[PDB]
Structure formats: C-alpha cells, structure tokens
C-alpha cells in the first residue's frame, strides 16, 4: 500500500 506524503 503506497503512502503519498503536502498540498495547500
């Protein structure tokens, strides 16, 4: 399971 780390 991939983790996709920030967007405003």
Resolution for this model in angstroms, one decimal place?
2.0
Method used to determine the 3D structure: X-ray
Find the radius of gyration of the CA atoms of the chain: 8
Residue-wise DSSP of the chain: --------
Q: How far, in Å, CA of 6 to CA of 8, rounded?
A: 7
Could you tell me the two tokens for 6? 């920030």
Dihedral pair phi/psi, residue 4, rounded to 5° = -110, 95
């Amino acid at each position: 399971h991939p983790f996709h780390x920030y967007y405003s």
